[PDB]
Curated annotation (Swiss-Prot):
The modification Phosphothreonine is found at T170, T173. Associates with MYD88 and IRAK2 to form a ternary complex called the Myddosome. Once phosphorylated, IRAK4 dissociates from the receptor complex and then associates with the TNF receptor-associated factor 6 (TRAF6), IRAK1, and PELI1; this intermediate complex is required for subsequent NF-kappa-B activation. Direct binding of SMAD6 to PELI1 prevents complex formation and hence negatively regulates IL1R-TLR signaling and eventually NF-kappa-B-mediated gene expression. Interacts with IL1RL1. Interacts (when phosphorylated) with IRAK1. May interact (when phosphorylated) with IRAK3. The keyword Isomerase does not apply. Its main location: cytoplasm. The modification Phosphoserine is found at S174. This is Interleukin-1 receptor-associated kinase 4. The chain holds residues 161 to 458 of 460 of the full protein. The lineage of its organism: Eukaryota, Metazoa, Chordata, Craniata, Vertebrata. Signal peptide: none annotated. ATP binds at residues 32-40, 53, 145-148, 161. Disulfide bonds: none annotated. Its cofactor is Mg(2+). It is an enzyme of class 2 (transferase). One of its GO terms (cellular component) is nucleus. Keywords: Acetylation, ATP-binding, Cytoplasm, Disease variant, Immunity, Innate immunity, Kinase, Magnesium, Nucleotide-binding, Phosphoprotein, Serine/threonine-protein kinase, Transferase.
Amino acid sequence: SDTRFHSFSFYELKNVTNNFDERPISVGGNKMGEGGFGVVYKGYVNNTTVAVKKLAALKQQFDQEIKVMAKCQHENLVELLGFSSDGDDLCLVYVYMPNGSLLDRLSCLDGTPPLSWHMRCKIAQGAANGINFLHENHHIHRDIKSANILLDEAFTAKISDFGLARASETVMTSRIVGTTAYMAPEALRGEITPKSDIYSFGVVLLEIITGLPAVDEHREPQLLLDIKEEIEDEEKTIEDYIDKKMNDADSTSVEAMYSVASQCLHEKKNKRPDIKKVQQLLQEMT
Ligand SMILES: Cc1cc(-n2ccc(C(=O)Nc3cc4cn(CCC(C)(C)O)nc4cc3C(C)(C)O)n2)ccn1
């Protein structure tokens, strides 16, 4: 049923994932990808396709995701269905995302067609609506990135992986977490603020425009957020960076998304727009 969280037995989860088959799902196995603290497997429970995150050799990431995802339910957030604690290895069960991650769709992994500019604008809007819900409910995601934006059967953006998420009732931490290529200057120093999630969203918007990953060792610049400087110093234009795997992009809406991305990427946290302004600006763009 869709009305309750289901506690599953480890043996049911080991069975529906073909004994946690680590061969890619594209080869006949069950591995869909891997988060920070586990591997995500495709499963079949109640005739339904599900996603199973096996936190193998943790606990803190199990009880966090259960706590955060019991409070946060929105159409632009990934839905948790249940969990497993009995047998050896902790497991988290989710509603399966038929189109995988934004990262995989932007890189056309496994033969998928490139996302149109139209689809890209709707995904940006959906992802911002999910972030707004989290911020309205005093949650800081701390790992906003294209791998953590999932796509359902209608390409509706769903923020996922709330293992590093933080509450509130500004703050500093000794244990710095996140993805360096997406992290704000203050988040790298240890500050905990929702303004850091806005910075990270700015990198995601650049990935949507360009189709380029946030970091690439064989690229100049290595870090995607550095293209903001090349465009500001008139060495390059946004036009030079627009993903060539699209046929429907128009300069005006691309420049309007770039302006939002540029504002999000301000080095001074207080000069960045809040999520409500990001939503407003992405709505005016279409
Ligand atoms: C880490 C984490 C994940 C999650 N969560 C929750 C749901 C899902 C989910 O369903 N995820 C994926 C589905 C995929 C489908 N496909 C097939 C695509 C096709 C046929 C078009 O090629 N590929 C995929 C890849 C992924 C991955 C694993 C990458 O997100 N993940 C939650 C909490 N934390």
